[PDB]
Design a protein around this ligand. Structure first.
Ligand SMILES: [N]S(=O)(=O)[C][C]C1234B567B89%10B%11%12%13B85%14B%1158B%12%11%15B%139%12B%1061B%12%112C5%153B%14874
Ligand SMILES: [Zn+2]
Length: 258
């Protein structure tokens, strides 16, 4: 009886195994755009993905992860609210059963069809597993997806999903360029928070881009054909793998833009 997203094991149950679920700096949150203060001390964000080396794509039973070789400083996030250098380890998405829900962060209560998370770890801690134990260990870049025109840069991901339909399946996935998933503007909100899945560790500087990317209905429909279950188990479609907004508590959301 492991955590997931259903009636009996979904987000409202996670606190029993992970009591930090009711903590002081949980994610996601609603971004109240009128209360987020512009902070002229924030820097432009520096997204340097030119040398990113993807390795593999995995269905882990709650999303699919595109994993990168993080053994050298190749794809890094710095600047913005961050001190130092954070290395890209993987990306994944959260999505809905329908286009009206799916994102984890909301914007004045607006839910997007999906949300992309590019996960990075602070190189001062040497590895991912050590970084998640530190309040400034991770930087997650959040990008909203709306349904409209196709994102050409997403198609290579969409087209491999039929090869990893079920939990535990993986496929080598080289030479994918994550620059093709970015919007035009790098205007962002930022706030201190957590992983949005168990273990829910309070180790994340969140950087959520204001500008959504557009993906096609066909693209997101292919996300919805994945399965939470393993091969030869009863089919449970991989949909609604999002945690709802959590209490902001004693936190300020800062905007990089006026
Ligand atoms: N949704 S999120 O806050 O970006 C959590 C991403 C992950 B990465 B892999 B383990 B590593 B740990 B667990 B697994 B994926 B979930 C948390 B992180
Ligand atoms: Zn995520």
């Amino acid at each position: 009886h492991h955590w997931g997203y259903g009636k009996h094991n979904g987000p409202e149950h996670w606190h029993k195994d992970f009591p930090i679920a009711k903590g002081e700096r949980q994610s996601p949150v609603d971004i109240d755009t009128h209360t987020a203060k512009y902070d002229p001390s924030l820097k432009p964000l520096s997204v340097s993905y030119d040398q990113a080396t993807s390795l593999r794509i995995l269905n882990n039973g709650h999303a699919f992860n595109v994993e990168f070789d993080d053994s050298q400083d190749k794809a890094v996030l710095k600047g913005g609210p961050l001190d130092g250098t954070y290395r890209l380890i993987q990306f994944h998405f959260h999505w809905g059963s329908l286009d009206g829900q799916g994102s984890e962060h909301t914007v004045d209560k607006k839910k997007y069809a999906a949300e992309l998370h590019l996960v990075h770890w602070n190189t001062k801690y040497g590895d991912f597993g050590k970084a998640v134990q530190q309040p400034d260990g991770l930087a997650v870049l959040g990008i909203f997806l709306k349904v409209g025109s196709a994102k050409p840069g997403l198609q290579k991901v969409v087209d491999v999903l039929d090869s990893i339909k079920t939990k535990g399946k993986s496929a080598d996935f080289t030479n994918f360029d994550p620059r093709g998933l970015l919007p035009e503007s790098l205007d962002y909100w930022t706030y201190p928070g957590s992983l949005t899945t168990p273990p829910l560790l309070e180790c994340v500087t969140w950087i959520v881009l204001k500008e959504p990317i557009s993906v096609s209905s066909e693209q997101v429909l292919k996300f919805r054909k994945l399965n939470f279950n393993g091969e030869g188990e009863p089919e449970e479609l991989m949909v609604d793998n999002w945690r709802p907004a959590q209490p902001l508590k004693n936190r300020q959301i800062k905007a990089s833009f006026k």
